[PDB]
Amino acid sequence: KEMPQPKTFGELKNLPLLNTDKPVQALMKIADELGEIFKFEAPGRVTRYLSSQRLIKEACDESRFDKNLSQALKFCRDFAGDGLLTSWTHEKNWKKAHNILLPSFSQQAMKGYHAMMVDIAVQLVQKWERLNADEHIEVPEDMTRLTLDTIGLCGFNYRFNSFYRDQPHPFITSMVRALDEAMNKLQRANPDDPAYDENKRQFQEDIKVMNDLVDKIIADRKASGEQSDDLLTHMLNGKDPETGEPLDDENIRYQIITFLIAGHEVTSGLLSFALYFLVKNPHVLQKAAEEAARVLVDPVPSYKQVKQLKYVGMVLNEALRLWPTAPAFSLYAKEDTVLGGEYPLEKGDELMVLIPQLHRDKTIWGDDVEEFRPERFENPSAIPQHAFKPFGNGQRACIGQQFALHEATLVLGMMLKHFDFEDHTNYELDIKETLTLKPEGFVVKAKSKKIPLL
Ligand code: HEM
Numbered sequence: 001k002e003m004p005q006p007k008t009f010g011e012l013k014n015l016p017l018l019n020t021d022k023p024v025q026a027l028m029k030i031a032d033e034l035g036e037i038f039k040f041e042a043p044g045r046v047t048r049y050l051s052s053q054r055l056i057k058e059a060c061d062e063s064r065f066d067k068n069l070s071q072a073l074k075f076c077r078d079f080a081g082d083g084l085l086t087s088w089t090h091e092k093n094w095k096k097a098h099n100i101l102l103p104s105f106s107q108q109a110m111k112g113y114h115a116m117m118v119d120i121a122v123q124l125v126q127k128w129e130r131l132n133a134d135e136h137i138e139v140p141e142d143m144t145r146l147t148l149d150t151i152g153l154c155g156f157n158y159r160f161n162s163f164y165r166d167q168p169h170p171f172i173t174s175m176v177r178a179l180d181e182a183m184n185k186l187q188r189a190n191p192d193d194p195a196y197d198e199n200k201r202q203f204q205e206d207i208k209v210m211n212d213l214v215d216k217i218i219a220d221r222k223a224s225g226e227q228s229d230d231l232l233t234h235m236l237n238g239k240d241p242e243t244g245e246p247l248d249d250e251n252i253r254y255q256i257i258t259f260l261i262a263g264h265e266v267t268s269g270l271l272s273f274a275l276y277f278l279v280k281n282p283h284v285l286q287k288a289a290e291e292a293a294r295v296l297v298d299p300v301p302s303y304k305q306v307k308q309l310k311y312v313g314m315v316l317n318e319a320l321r322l323w324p325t326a327p328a329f330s331l332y333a334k335e336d337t338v339l340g341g342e343y344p345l346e347k348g349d350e351l352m353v354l355i356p357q358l359h360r361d362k363t364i365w366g367d368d369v370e371e372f373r374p375e376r377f378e379n380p381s382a383i384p385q386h387a388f389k390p391f392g393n394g395q396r397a398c399i400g401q402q403f404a405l406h407e408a409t410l411v412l413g414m415m416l417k418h419f420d421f422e423d424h425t426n427y428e429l430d431i432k433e434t435l436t437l438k439p440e441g442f443v444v445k446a447k448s449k450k451i452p453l454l
C-alpha cells in the first residue's frame with residue numbers, strides 16, 4: 001500500500017503543519033482524515049505517524065523496533081544529556097542507569113517516598129482549605145506546584161517551596177524556558193542565521209543555571225555524607241550489577257534534571273485532566289468521592305490505603321486514555337521489516353506513535369471513545385495488547401510510572417475526601433501544548449467538607 005500524506009508546502013514538505021500552537025491536536029486531525037498511518041516529511045526528515053492498535057502492536061515489538069530520539073528529545077538532550085529519557089538504548093549510560101534506578105522506582109520503593117509525597121499533598125490541601133469564600137483554584141498551576149515539589153523532595157531532598165511563591169524557583173524558570181526553546185526550535189530552517197543569536201545565548205544561560213544548582217546539590221550531598229530516602233542517595237551509592245560501576249557525577253546530574261523535566265509536567269497534566277473529567281462527569285466524581293471517603297479513614301493516607309483507591313486509579317487511567325500527557329514516542333526499525341503486511345520498512349526507518357489517537361481506536365474501545373468511563377479499566381486482561389500506551393513501551397517505558405500513579409492517586413484521593421468541587425465557569429477545554437499537554441485556564445471552586453488533617 002501507498003501510505004497517505006497530508007498537504008505539502010513545496011520544498012518545506014509537511015513542516016509548516018507543525019508551525020501551530022497545538023501541533024499534537026493538528027496531527028490528531030490529520031489522523032482523523034488520513035487514517036491509521038501517514039507519512040510526514042520535512043527537510044532532512046521522514047517519519048510515519050501511527051494511530052491504530054493494529055499497527056502500533058507491531059511497532060511495540062522490541063525485536064523489530066527500538067526507541068528513536070524524536071527531534072524534540074534530541075533538542076532536550078542539550079540539557080538532559082544522556083539521562084534515561086534522552087539516551088539511546090545502545091549508550092552505555094542508558095543500561096547502567098536503568099539497572100541502577102529500577103529498584104528506586106519500584107512499587108516497593110514507593111513505600112519509602114510516601115511520607116514525602118504526603119508532605120506536599122498536605123500543603124496542597126491546606127492551601128485550598130485556606131481560600132476565602134468565593135476565591136477559586138487555578139488547577140494546572142497548583143498541580144504543577146505539587147508535582148515539582150514532590151519530585152524535588154523525593155528526588156534529592158530539596159524544597160522548591162512552590163506553595164510559598166507566585167514566581168517559581170529560579171531553576172524552574174530556567175527549566176521551563178529551556179523546554180520552551182527546545183520545542184520552538186522545531187521550525188527553524190537556518191539555525192545559524194545570526195537572527196537567533198539571542199535565543200542561542202539565552203538557551204546556554206538556562207542550561208548553566210540548571211547545571212550549577214544540580215551540581216551544587218550533588219557536591220553538597222557528598223560533602224555532608226548524609227543518607228536520605230531520595231533518589232540522589234540511591235545514585236551516589238548504587239552499583240550497576242552488570243558492569244559493577246556506579247554513575248558518575250555528571251550522569252547523576254543529568255538524571256536529576258531528567259526527573260524534573262520528565263515527570264513534573266506529565267504528572268501535573270494528568271491530575272488536571274483527571275479533575276476536569278471528574279467535574280464534567282458528576283456521577284463519576286460521586287463514585288470516586290465515595291471511594292475516597294470509604295478508604296481514607298485516617299487523618300493522613302497510608303501507603304496501603306492509596307493502593308486501595310481502585311476506582312481513583314481507574315479514573316486516572318481513563319484520563320490518560322483521553323489525554324495522555326506525554327503525547328508521543330518514536331521508534332526506528334532495527335532491520336528491514338513489513339508493518340501490518342502492507343507497509344515495507346527499511347532498516348532505520350522511523351515511526352511516531354500518536355498516543356491520543358491510538359486511545360481513540362474505535363475497534364478497541366467502541367463507538368463511545370470520547371466518553372469518560374473509568375469502568376473501561378476494571379480488568380487489564382480485557383484490554384488488547386498495546387492498546388493503552390500512556391507510559392511508552394518495553395524496556396524504554398516510563399521508569400516513573402509507579403511514582404506518577406502513586407502521587408496522582410494519593411493527591412486525587414485527598415482532594416476528593418476533603419472538598420466538593422464546582423465547575424463555576426463551565427470551563428471550555430483548551431489544551432495547551434508544550435512538550436506535554438495540559439488544560440489551560442482550568443479553574444474550579446472547592447468547598448471544604450471540614451474534615452481535619454490532624
Ligand atoms: C502521567 C505521568 C507520566 C507519563 C504519562 C509519562 C510518560 C512517559 C513516556 C510515554 C515515556 C516513554 C518516552 C519515549 O519512549 O520516548 C516515558 C519515559 C520516561 N519517564 Fe515518564 N511519564 C510520566 C511520569 C514520569 C515521572 C514522574 C518520572 C520521574 C519522576 C518520569 C521519568 C521518565 C524517564 C526517566 C523516562 C525514560 C525511561 C527510559 O527510557 O529508561 N516519568 N515517560
Ligand SMILES: O=C(CCCCn1ccnc1)N[C@@H](Cc1ccccc1)C(=O)O
Pocket residue numbers: 018023024070071072073183186261262266325326327328329330352434435436
Ligand atoms: O514526540 C514528541 C515529543 C514528546 C515527548 C513526550 N514526553 C513528555 C515527557 N516525557 C515524554 N512530539 C510530537 C508532537 C509535536 C510535534 C511538534 C511540536 C510539538 C509536539 C512529535 O514530534 O511529533
